[PDB]
Amino acid sequence: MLSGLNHLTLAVSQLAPSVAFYQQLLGMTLHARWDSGAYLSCGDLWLCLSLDPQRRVTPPEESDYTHYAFSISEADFASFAARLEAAGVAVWKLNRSEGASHYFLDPDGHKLELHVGSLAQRLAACREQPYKGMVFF
């Protein structure tokens, strides 16, 4: 059977600024870097940044809702979000439609999110404030 996410690979247009974003700004751990990529971890997540000449810097109105959310604790959430804001990190969404979340963009316009809470906690919240037509299995 499938047993989780083995890795997330993001295509990047400029490797050095992307490594700086994920390692310096977001605090992920850099394990290795080469001419065409980098390997980082964020807790158990294996993140690969892959230099791709096809990657375009994409404004958020031009891309669909596909996005990648990173876990953060309730105690750290607000100050991390505020630090990203003060650093000039672009955003893509304001309405909290799935709980406590901050929506921000990477240098290439990959849609990212800080989120507080597990799937179990989101299902429990949705039982009280369900999305239209929601059914639970």
C-beta separation of 49 from 18 below 8 A: yes
CA dihedral 92, 96, 97, 101 (to 10 degrees): 80
Q: Which of 18, 74, 78, 122 binds a copy of itself (CB under 8 A)?
A: 122
| Residues contacting a copy of itself: total by CB under 8 A | 65
In 3D, which of 94, 96, 97 has the Cα closest to residue 130? 97
CB 93, min distance to Mn ion, A: 9
CA dihedral 99, 103, 62, 26 (to 10 degrees): -140
Nearest 5°: phi and psi at 27?
80, 15
Residue 113 known to bind ligand = yes
CB 88, min distance to a copy of itself, A: 19
Place of tokens 């809470």: 117
In 3D, which of 118, 16, 14 has the Cα closest to residue 69? 118
Q: Which of 43, 53, 88, 133 binds ligand UI7 (CB under 6 A)?
A: 133
CB 38, min distance to a copy of itself, A: 10
DSSP state of 22: I
Q: Which amino acid is at 18?
A: S
Question: 114 contacts which partner out of a copy of itself, ligand UI7, Mn ion, none, CB within 5 to 8 A by kind?
Answer: a copy of itself
Please report whether residue 74 would count as binding a copy of itself according to CB under 8 A: no
Q: Which of 17, 24, 36, 59 binds a copy of itself (CB under 8 A)?
A: 36
Nearest 5°: phi and psi at 23?
-85, -55
Q: Interface with ligand UI7 by CB under 6 A: which residues? A: 33, 35, 133, 135
Name the residues that contact a copy of itself, by CB under 8 A. 1-11, 26-28, 30-37, 39, 41-46, 50, 52, 54-56, 63-73, 76, 80, 110, 113-115, 117-119, 122-123, 126, 130-137
